[PDB]
Design a protein around this ligand. Sequence first.
Ligand SMILES: CC(C)(COP(=O)(O)OP(=O)(O)OC[C@H]1O[C@@H](n2cnc3c(N)ncnc32)[C@H](O)[C@@H]1OP(=O)(O)O)[C@@H](O)C(=O)NCCC(=O)NCCS
Ligand SMILES: CC(C)(COP(=O)(O)OP(=O)(O)OC[C@H]1O[C@@H](n2cnc3c(N)ncnc32)[C@H](O)[C@@H]1OP(=O)(O)O)[C@@H](O)C(=O)NCCC(=O)NCCS
Lengths: 392, 392
Amino acid sequence: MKEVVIASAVRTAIGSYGKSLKDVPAVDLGATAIKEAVKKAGIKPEDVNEVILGNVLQAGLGQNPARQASFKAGLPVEIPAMTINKVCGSGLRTVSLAAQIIKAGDADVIIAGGMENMSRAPYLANNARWGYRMGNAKFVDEMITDGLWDAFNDYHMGITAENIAERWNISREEQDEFALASQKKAEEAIKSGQFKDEIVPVVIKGRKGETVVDTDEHPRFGSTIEGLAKLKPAFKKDGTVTAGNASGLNDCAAVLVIMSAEKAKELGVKPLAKIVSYGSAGVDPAIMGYGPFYATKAAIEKAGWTVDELDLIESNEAFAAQSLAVAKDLKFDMNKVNVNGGAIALGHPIGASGARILVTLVHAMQKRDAKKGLATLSIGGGQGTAILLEKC
Amino acid sequence: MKEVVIASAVRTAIGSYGKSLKDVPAVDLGATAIKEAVKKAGIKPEDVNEVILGNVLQAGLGQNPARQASFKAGLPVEIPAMTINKVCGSGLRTVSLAAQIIKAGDADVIIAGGMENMSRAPYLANNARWGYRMGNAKFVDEMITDGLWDAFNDYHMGITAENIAERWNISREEQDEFALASQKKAEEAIKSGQFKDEIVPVVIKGRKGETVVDTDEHPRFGSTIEGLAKLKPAFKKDGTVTAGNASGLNDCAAVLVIMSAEKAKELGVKPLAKIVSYGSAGVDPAIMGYGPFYATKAAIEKAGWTVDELDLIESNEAFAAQSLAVAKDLKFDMNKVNVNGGAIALGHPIGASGARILVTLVHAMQKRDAKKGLATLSIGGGQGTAILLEKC
Ligand SMILES: CC(C)(COP(=O)(O)OP(=O)(O)OC[C@H]1O[C@@H](n2cnc3c(N)ncnc32)[C@H](O)[C@@H]1OP(=O)(O)O)[C@@H](O)C(=O)NCCC(=O)NCCS
Ligand SMILES: CC(C)(COP(=O)(O)OP(=O)(O)OC[C@H]1O[C@@H](n2cnc3c(N)ncnc32)[C@H](O)[C@@H]1OP(=O)(O)O)[C@@H](O)C(=O)NCCC(=O)NCCS
């Protein structure tokens, strides 16, 4: 097989629900990231063979959101594009799909990653076409239905976290301590400039002014264990899961240029990392948060690695409960996990999230000179996906 | 690299808008086709490595429609799934994506295809979440916006068909004659049993009864040139494109089992066709209907074939105008094109359409003993995709 590398890795800041990125469509976040990713790779727009982007809340975004992001980015109309939906895994899975297509001999350069604007999701009327006839009906929150609700069990993803808290015996306190540690890591990383290299600014041009968004806004600086302990349960009576130990609803795009090592050499690109292996797996939807266990095991086996060999790990924090279960069973050294904070603090912009963690991983590997890295995350509907990277 | 084969190919009947399959969600049509494809292929569900399905109108369908179809088919939960949106080409692109993943060394057996229920598309309120504040707004038809409207030029796909008609001087009369020919061929094919081997019946459990849908209902038997000439332009004043010479809005699923030739031999499968090559291409969105010209050329070049070596062709009839343009420029022998009718008569269920013409092609190739086949179609947003088959 051809070897496959990451040439550049870029993301917008992660905006909070209804806040900083509320007026910026997902496809415009995506275009902002694409332009800057192409520029950071040091290639020309004409060098890209395909665009593959994750997006989950596609409702009313218009034909083929990936194609829209591409066009708005200045990429030639000649380049094909497609939009992938694997829920939370979308943005990570496009990167392994890119690797697969390159290994198949069909391209040398692919723009991958994902984009999401949860703040902009519509409401739906399911029976307006042919009519309600009589009686009240549901005005459906598309964000919940398309992104956050289990289609088999008829409950919120937060209930899948409670299921994991119950079965693995992970206490509210353990969940709150994990959340607090993520907040503290995120604050320290932001203030020490760890994200400065990876974040492309988004310029919001209104009728009257320009505003620049370039800082993650979701973290709660000065978080305390007492603050967390007082929070009410978010999903069920007497639940362990709360807004403080669950990831948020957020807006972001994150994009990587993926290439064959031989194309990168030819074009003078200095790659950030090699994509070593990857894997995807399914699990019972009721415990979807455990998906990364199987996906990580598959990818590691494929690579001929072990977990102990890993230098840095990004394991997406959909919920403390599930992150803890996964870490425990994979026996992670928690000092190597989400060293710049995770999604409890930073947010979870579902379509983008997988790509966002990989962006974060590859920049952290460069800065810390770490040789081997893992990114993996859980997927609503009962899946996991993972990618292993090696420094070039 | 590994050789890639099609082990089975099945579709539901194509229902008309608001009619026979109005009460059957896309994911249920998909599940129906998946179960029958796995059966026809002669494999176990546990031999399947991934499910990759096209679906365009995802709004309110719940998390990850491909996973839902996979789950409702009875496939084991350990199998991963993802949903692809490349508009009209979604269903065909999943097949070449499967071939790429297999060629990459990452799987041996993939369920691919597409599913769509256009009758069931919701209406949307885009600003219900944070408020309209004041003034009337749009109650958005999600089928139009997500499937049929150009995101760049702000007009219907039918206007892209007028554009081609104007550029190429394809007259109303020429479009109507092409339409009539498609209708006659579909009638002949339906009545002569050509679609019997490929159609899986859909069993609808109504309160009143149990009903079975197993026949394509869109064709209009006894269509006449005079009947076509009386129709009004559907998209612009004094236009050439009408309801009669455009494809319809339709509901269907079409699924294929794709495997390495090595695995097929190990499992005792007798394949239907080898996948020889494939391609995708982008064009200006305004002339999207021309996408197959470039896609087809790429595929044929990769294969080192020529157009005149083709024994059967399925070139999707999004509109008579664009089918006629692609056909003139690729120089097709029209007697080998859409021999069982095309989408003007049969319908165009967007996410499934590209898989549906591939199903139709492979069955037609076994019936007529043809050696080489091409499936190609246009994509809204200015793309094309194509697959080349050689009969085993
Ligand atoms: C949990 C959830 C319902 C909360 O949504 P919300 O009510 O809009 O959340 P908010 O961020 O507004 O938080 C509400 C209040 O909780 C409190 N809160 C949240 N995090 C806190 C923290 N670290 N410390 C103290 N208080 C906190 C605050 O009081 C906040 O009010 P404020 O913003 O005025 O201070 C939502 O984030 C959610 O659904 N998350 C899970 C997402 C998910 O399932 N993703 C898919 C994973 S597979
Ligand atoms: C053209 C379009 C708007 C028509 O929608 P519609 O009005 O719902 O179409 P209908 O099937 O109801 O047809 C309307 C009337 O036209 C007439 N008609 C359609 N096909 C006909 C034919 N072969 N002969 C005679 N009359 C015909 C009929 O009178 C019909 O009324 P009836 O069924 O009551 O007899 C719709 O099919 C469309 O938008 N098609 C294009 C889809 C598209 O763009 N797809 C994407 C491609 S990239």
